[PDB]
Design a protein around this ligand. Structure first.
Ligand code: FE
Length: 202
DNA sequence: AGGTAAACGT
DNA sequence: AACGGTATTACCT
């Protein structure tokens, strides 16, 4: 059974690419550090985030925003690594989205206990483009629902190297990550990373 | 009009 | 601990 209409999980797709991806995560973070963002309502998110590519997702007092500039550094987000772009393109193609051209990559870091409550990826003006989501390090339970918050959730363990792609009918589906279980991974040690690729501009 | 933030009790 | 209330409003454009 496929994940959902327009959605697929490519298990261990990024396994072979993972070591390089993690080197590049470190490189990106060395320029735009991971930060736990504060919601408009004033709560600090448990996931630490950064971005690369032309547009980075951030919170603001007034809401969520894509910006070409990191509000923390006041500099552009780091360029999207070629390893990221190449893996994203290969995954998108395998998943049936050959023409996807991301301009934004959000990098998420989960420590034990860190979670991401159900939400929609909805800040992008062009909903034709899919989301490509790469998991690295410790395993996590991914919730994938529907268009409405109360729609039944599927729970999928995402393991190191797994890639999930959603788009088309499932583009705006609610999704999230359950509190990360403590553990060890030879490549990330004690955390999970996730790369989320999007086309956030025109 | 419409968009839209949302991360505690049972 | 899985599920669902809350935004059933209060603003901005
Ligand atoms: Fe998301």
């Amino acid at each position: 059974e496929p994940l959902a209409a327009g959605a697929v999980i490519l298990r261990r797709f990024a396994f072979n690419a993972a070591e390089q991806l993690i080197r590049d995560i470190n490189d990106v973070a060395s320029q735009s550090p991971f930060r736990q963002m504060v919601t408009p309502g004033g709560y600090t998110m448990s996931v630490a985030m950064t971005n690369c590519g032309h547009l980075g997702w951030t919170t603001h007092r007034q809401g969520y925003l894509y910006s070409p500039i990191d509000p923390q550094t006041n500099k552009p987000w780091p360029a999207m690594p070629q390893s990221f772009h190449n893996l994203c393109q290969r995954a998108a193609t395998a998943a049936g989205y050959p023409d996807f051209q991301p301009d934004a990559c959000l990098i998420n870091r989960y420590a034990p206990g860190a979670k991401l409550c159900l939400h929609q990826d909805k800040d992008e003006p062009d909903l034709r483009a899919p989301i490509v989501s790469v998991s690295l390090g410790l395993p996590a339970i991914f919730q994938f629902g529907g268009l409405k918050r109360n729609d039944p959730l599927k729970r999928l363990l995402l393991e190191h190297g797994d890639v999930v792609v959603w788009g088309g009918e499932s583009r705006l589906f609610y999704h999230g990550i359950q509190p990360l279980k403590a553990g060890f991974h030879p490549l990330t040690i004690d955390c999970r990373y996730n790369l989320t690729f999007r086309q956030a501009g025109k």
